[PDB]
Structure 1
């Protein structure tokens, strides 16, 4: 079994847990829990961070024999390479590179927001530029089944997480309907994914750590 370590929260590990589940990778999880509210008690993780033999300790991490990685994108590319779920053609690789990076810029934007004490003050500007961000992704996907072509890749798990989060935030966003929605329905109908979602291991929320103003429940 491979070991995935991350906080007992959705966050940056969602796409990794889904990929691990789809590619049928035997795994276990180390889900670090919190302690005394409301004082930030990372101790469960902190008591273990500098004793795992990781080169750049962080969350999430994945241990697979002597392979010890940190950096979520790196863990994905690692899992994906064992099942050829990275690009194959040059153009597919460019589409993968550009989106993995772009999806992180949108993930951080959102993260920044739900974390700021000025959330309600920032919410309107954010929603002002959401639609356009979504139109871009819709235009990029076009009529393809997946973000790169007919081949499903790790960037599709990334895209699903990021889009499902935005769907969480604003459930009836016009730009969310259309090819973006069908994409979501396309992802959730994948056999091992459907099965994972109806299992008792799947955690749809909370998206963020307990200190977040939006969705920490």
Structure 2
């Protein structure tokens, strides 16, 4: 049975975006609940682990953005065709998440924030882009012969990095091509044109 899905997150792409891409690709109806800082204290206090996004499935609350994303892609063409391919997909996803999680997003000190950010973007990001390009190895998609949610996450994470470092992929045309390929998937393209425009 098709459940009632309610996604709760801040008004931004951020960590909720991978879930939104999956819902769009699979044409799944859901409530895109974007809260305001004002209502967060209250909502926060009722969550088992106090972090968002969370996805309520028929009232049962699920947490952890990638755990949710994997759950929604189970038994779909986005998971990876084989058990091994699923491992490769899960691996690329965590490699991207690991990096994104290195940034101190809370930081209020514009300068010292822009220093931890500056180091990561200037000194570490290019190394990761190289390894991702090497991994793709001239192939059309990151894993196997068709799109997986690892490709969705690559496009999502790179879009965020590009906001702060526009020259991120100047030495990786093949990574730019993969981004465009993901962005061209009809359901994804439709979501990209319609989603609320936010900075992150």
Is this a same-fold pair by TM over 0.5?
yes
Flag the 1:124–1:61 CA change in 2: closer, same or farther, 3 A: closer
**Distance in structure 2 (CA, Å) of the matches to 1:137 and 1:206:** 25
Equivalent in 124, 129, 146 of residue 134 of structure 1? 129
Deviation at 1:19, TM superposition (A): 1.4
Flag the 1:134–1:204 CA change in 2: closer, same or farther, 3 A: farther
Equivalent in 140, 144, 151 of residue 146 of structure 2? 151
Structure-2-length-normalised TM-score: 0.86
Deviation at 1:120, TM superposition (A): 3.3
Deviation at 1:175, TM superposition (A): 4.4
- Structure 2 residues without counterparts, runs of 5 or longer: none
Flag the 1:4–1:187 CA change in 2: closer, same or farther, 3 A: same
- Structure 1 residues without counterparts, runs of 5 or longer: 35-42, 208-217
* 1:116-127 equivalence runs, <5 A: 117=109, 118-126=112-120, 127=122
Deviation at 1:84, TM superposition (A): 4.1
Equivalent in 20, 24, 33 of residue 21 of structure 1? 24
Over the aligned positions, Cα root-mean-square deviation in angstroms equals 2.2
Deviation at 1:154, TM superposition (A): 1.8
Structure-1-length-normalised TM-score: 0.79
Deviation at 1:115, TM superposition (A): 3.1
SS for the counterpart of 2:104 is helix
